[PDB]
């Protein structure tokens, strides 16, 4: 996260770290949506241009964390993966269209002060809140600058951007399964996702029921925190029919 700040303890209790078994390293962010399901970006698991193709046994998820590198004894919980599900129309060839994946845990995780699931949006919450100028929140342990790494989880609040401005900022083809967020050059404030924040959550707090909803997944950007560029996030509600199909049947 660029130009964010240290998270408070328990601020993002749905935050998940995707961790490689060997070598032991951070791979991505992710989010907890039930006691056995974790949501992430498909490009965290499958991205052939970089020879990335992770299988279940390659990976662990670490839940309840704050520190990036420490083993947080008596606080974090480490879970093995039963199965990975990638969206069948994930477009890794062109523009990361439908950049979404689910991971089922081998055993359900116990909730705690530090471990708790986020809500997924209903149609009405999405229609109400996914509006230009309205702010959401991104969390992660990724890089602090485009060209280092944080000691603890980072947080940044960012406004959703009008779709014509998103489109006019890039030569990459945008789709309805994406939205973009960040400040404009003239707006003063800064901030963005970056490498390593991939797969983490873009959340909003509903003013109607005071619950946190995951509206987006950290997906793609050209650089990090560049003027006139914006971060792009998977549109969770647009892909919720697939989410529900996987969970109902698996």
């Amino acid at each position: 996260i660029v130009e964010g700040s240290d998270a408070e303890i328990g601020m993002s209790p749905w935050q998940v770290m995707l961790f490689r078994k060997s070598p032991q390293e951070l791979l991505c962010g992710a989010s907890l949506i039930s006691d056995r399901w974790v949501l992430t970006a498909a490009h965290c698991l499958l991205y052939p241009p970089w020879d990335k193709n992770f299988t279940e046994n390659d990976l662990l998820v670490r839940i309840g964390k704050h520190s990036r590198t420490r083993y947080e004894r008596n606080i974090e919980k480490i879970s093995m993966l039963e199965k990975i599900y990638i969206h069948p129309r994930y477009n890794w060839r062109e523009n990361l269209d439908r950049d979404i994946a689910l991971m089922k845990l081998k055993k359900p995780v116990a909730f705690s002060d530090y471990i708790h699931p986020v809500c997924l949006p209903d149609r009405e919450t999405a229609a109400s809140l996914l509006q230009a100028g309205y702010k959401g929140r991104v969390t992660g342990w990724g890089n602090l600058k485009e060209t280092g790494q944080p000691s603890v989880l980072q947080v940044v609040n960012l406004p959703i951007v009008e779709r014509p401005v998103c489109k006019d900022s890039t030569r990459i083809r945008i789709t309805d399964n994406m939205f973009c967020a960040g400040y404009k050059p003239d707006e003063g404030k800064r901030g963005d996702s970056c490498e390593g924040d991939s797969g983490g959550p873009f959340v909003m707090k509903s003013p109607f029921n005071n619950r946190w909803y995951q509206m987006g997944i950290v997906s793609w950007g050209e650089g990090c925190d560049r003027d006139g560029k914006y971060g792009f996030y998977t549109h969770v509600f647009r892909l919720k029919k697939w989410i529900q199909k996987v969970i109902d049947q698996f």
């Binding site: 961790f19 032991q24 390293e25 590198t69 083993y71 480490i78 093995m80």
Partner: peptide
């Protein structure tokens, strides 16, 4: 750069 995690989880 990461503190080693318990062997239990790497079984």
């Amino acid at each position: 750069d990461f503190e080693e995690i318990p062997e239990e989880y790497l079984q």
